[PDB]
Write an enzyme that holds these catalytic residues in place. Structure first.
Site, short mmCIF file in Angstrom:
data_model
loop_
_atom_site.label_atom_id
_atom_site.label_comp_id
_atom_site.label_asym_id
_atom_site.label_seq_id
_atom_site.Cartn_x
_atom_site.Cartn_y
_atom_site.Cartn_z
N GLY D 12 0.81 -1.21 0.00
CA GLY D 12 0.00 0.00 0.00
C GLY D 12 0.84 1.26 0.00
O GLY D 12 0.79 2.05 0.95
N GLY D 50 11.64 4.91 -9.01
CA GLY D 50 12.66 4.99 -10.04
C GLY D 50 13.74 3.95 -9.82
O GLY D 50 13.47 2.75 -9.72
N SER D 138 -3.79 1.70 14.02
CA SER D 138 -4.67 2.85 14.10
C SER D 138 -5.04 3.03 15.56
O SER D 138 -5.36 2.06 16.23
CB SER D 138 -5.94 2.63 13.25
OG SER D 138 -6.88 3.70 13.38
N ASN D 145 -13.89 2.91 18.07
CA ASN D 145 -14.59 4.05 17.50
C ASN D 145 -15.96 3.61 17.01
O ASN D 145 -16.10 2.56 16.39
CB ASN D 145 -13.78 4.65 16.34
CG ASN D 145 -14.22 6.05 15.98
OD1 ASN D 145 -14.59 6.83 16.85
ND2 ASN D 145 -14.18 6.37 14.70
N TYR D 151 -13.14 -2.21 11.61
CA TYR D 151 -11.82 -1.61 11.54
C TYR D 151 -11.07 -1.77 12.87
O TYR D 151 -9.89 -2.12 12.89
CB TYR D 151 -11.97 -0.14 11.16
CG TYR D 151 -10.70 0.56 10.76
CD1 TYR D 151 -10.05 0.24 9.58
CD2 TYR D 151 -10.17 1.57 11.55
CE1 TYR D 151 -8.88 0.89 9.20
CE2 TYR D 151 -9.01 2.22 11.18
CZ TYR D 151 -8.37 1.88 10.01
OH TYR D 151 -7.21 2.53 9.64
N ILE D 184 -4.32 11.39 10.40
CA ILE D 184 -3.24 11.80 9.50
C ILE D 184 -3.84 12.51 8.29
O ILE D 184 -4.73 11.98 7.62
CB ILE D 184 -2.37 10.61 9.07
CG1 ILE D 184 -1.79 9.93 10.31
CG2 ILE D 184 -1.26 11.09 8.15
CD1 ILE D 184 -1.03 10.89 11.24
#
Lengths: 249, 244, 244, 244
Positions: D12, D50, D138, D145, D151, D184
């Site tokens: 990711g 690169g 997290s 939450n 999550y 973030i």
């Protein structure tokens, strides 16, 4: 009477994995305090045996938690016979220990599904009634492993820590409506197993436990029954560790 | 009943948490010695405890005063089975404004008192191979709170104390635990302004302030014979204010 | 380097972690003032810091020495940008044999010291809206340990203090954090029997004792601009002996 | 404190936290393979890496894709020394509206992925007796939450998993750690209501959203040779949003 609030009468309690060990201890304790317990098991033999010892105080049913279809008729059976579930106890944990390099995909998946996602499915299914009533209890039988981690048990540890995270979130959602969502985390508990362990094996288990004993199934039950009671309405999103000091906080 | 034949020392039992603990124990069959800083304090305790127990004057910061109360209890009742440390005060201030004696008082009253009173009851507990030490901490020790760094050190430190002590005495049937309350409705919280109260309640998912009995119920469970496999643990009773 | 123009105050910098912290901060461009209990300690500390800093005698329990040290730091260097609180001691004993004095000394030196020193350097940090307070705690404060109930009360207590302090000064660009060493190799540990060092290594999944430098690297990280979004946090460096 | 000769695999790595992780290791001497779920994202990663690495497409819920990437990487680069699991997504809903696959996808993308990738690079790290595993968690996994129960269950599960894997491989010089970001700043973040942003900032004592680079530093420190005695640890980078 004084202690009138202490009774569980009028309350319906759903306990998964109620055939033996902790689960049986929970169902029996809740009944002794006046609740109608519905215990569930994985096999039809398991359900019948549960119905035997519950007798008139409750019902055994075979619920295969993993199958979402199994949940719906089990809850419907309860609603038709007894009513809506006041107290949900999630106790359907298994173990498939291995070290990481030797750990099969099925052993990871089956632990995640039986020990972690089982909690989500059942919590959702009983959620709505408790929100209408503005009163509810959800308690999940955790494990000290989920907090501490244990080599060869990374799947267990992942599931057992996950249900804590799942519970804290659920707690935040339903706290305002008189519902409580907590975890009870046992340490080494003495079971149908353990009695056949070897002296060397049993010694090595005891070295880890400052209390110097294995806990009793009932010790876990009395934690659960306190949290499911009317004098624990101010505890949500909390983990009650019952492990003889094997770990702290 | 549940505490048949058990002698409990509850410090700071004049009101709120302390009074709710003492009465919960008495209502469940314990002989209870409740503690206060003042004569009338102790007198009023003895008044409500009546035949089931006794109020004494205790200064948790004074070693001599501890010595007399415990020696007093031993003479008339016996050795202490269940110790509940519920002394504890606040002296809030931002750090930049906190006076040295506001620090030291909070440290002495809320942390070092836990050391003195536990050491004083433990010999007998070790000998009997059974016991209960329970300390009333605070969510603040786990979460931290601006304007309360002295409180937060003390309530955190009593957990580190409890843990070590719980390791020293686990093998002999004694547990040592902490009940950590959130916001509990008291005199002072009924005295807050409408805007302050809204700020408190906003921190609590449950949407209410806790009641003293809620702490009392938690303490009686941990002090019961069914809580025997719980040592070195903190039981948070904060309505969701903070989690794990 | 990373710490150009910053002034760092490292308490207990004679040897071990304190020295390793002081050296790393100098390596990375900071002017460091290390402290020691004795005037002789300051001698050595100045000896190894050289033109990059200075040693000073500091008695963390004495407000009189705290001020003097700060005046001299402000005079010769400027305002402390970085406070590392590493003035810990030990007085192990089991609760039954712990002297009132062994408790108090540990609480004073290891916990109340963090209060006085943090308070003293804080005003300037808020005036500049930038700063670092880092305290050296211990795994003992999180897990607890028999024979160290005084040390663990303190090591845990300074975390409650840090969580509160962090909340007071977060708005102003300051971080307040704790680094928690497990078993770190000192001259004391080197002097242990083969049986003792075996017993320690059994507790540490990493198979070894940590090094002073390893703690310093954690401190250096937290003191850096790459940790400015980290506050109120404990960083456990104990080779897996305890987890989270 | 270079990463010379080291090969790091950041899942990711298209944008945000993962691209800053990827870019930062490159700048400290690592050759880096960054991954994305589409071949276009894998193209863009190759462009910004690169010469110092390569982008590749990886579906973390598919064992086949995992092998294809890893054997590719062994071909052109070698064995993976460093593994960063930054492949979380969300699927937010209150529990009553959360659908079965919404629960299942987040458990499989955010947790079982950690299992599958960690086992996938473990053997080579075991033979070399050195390694780094770091998972981007997290604060949600710690504090929980509302509307994020899937999550949080995953973000917590990966701490429990990380703790026991740490125990398995600690003696062979491999650390396994978690970094737990708070809020973030991302592209999705800059594009919300003032009302939304104000409500995010309300929860952060630091007064600000964290930056992707700040998370990369924590990861960079944890993957460095200076973090060798940290294992099974969560490092919280949340501006004080939550504490310990």
């Amino acid at each position: 009477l004084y202690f009138q609030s202490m009774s569980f009468e009028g309350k319906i309690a759903l306990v998964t994995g109620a055939s033996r060990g902790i689960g049986r201890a929970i169902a029996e304790t809740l009944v002794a305090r006046g609740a109608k317990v519905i215990g569930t098991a994985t096999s039809e033999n398991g359900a019948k045996n549960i119905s035997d010892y519950l007798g008139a105080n409750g019902k055994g049913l075979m619920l295969n938690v993993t199958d979402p279809a199994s949940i719906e008729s089990v809850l419907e059976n309860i609603r038709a016979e007894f009513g809506e579930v006041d107290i949900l106890v999630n106790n359907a944990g298994i173990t498939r220990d291995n070290l990481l390099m030797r750990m099969k995909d099925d052993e990871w998946n089956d632990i995640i599904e039986t020990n972690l996602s089982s909690v989500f499915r059942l919590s959702k299914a009983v959620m709505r009634a408790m929100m209408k009533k503005r009163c509810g209890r959800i308690i999940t039988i955790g494990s000290v492993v989920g907090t501490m981690g244990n080599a060869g048990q990374a799947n267990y540890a992942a599931a057992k820590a996950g249900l804590i995270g799942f519970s804290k979130s659920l707690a935040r959602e339903v706290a305002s409506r008189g519902i409580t969502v907590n975890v009870v985390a046992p340490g080494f508990i003495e079971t149908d197993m353990t009695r056949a362990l070897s002296d060397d094996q049993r010694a090595g288990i005891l070295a880890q436990v400052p209390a110097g004993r294995l806990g009793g199934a009932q010790e876990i039950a009395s934690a659960v029954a306190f949290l499911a009671s009317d004098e624990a309405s101010y505890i949500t999103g909390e983990t009650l560790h019952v492990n003889g000091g094997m770990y702290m906080v």
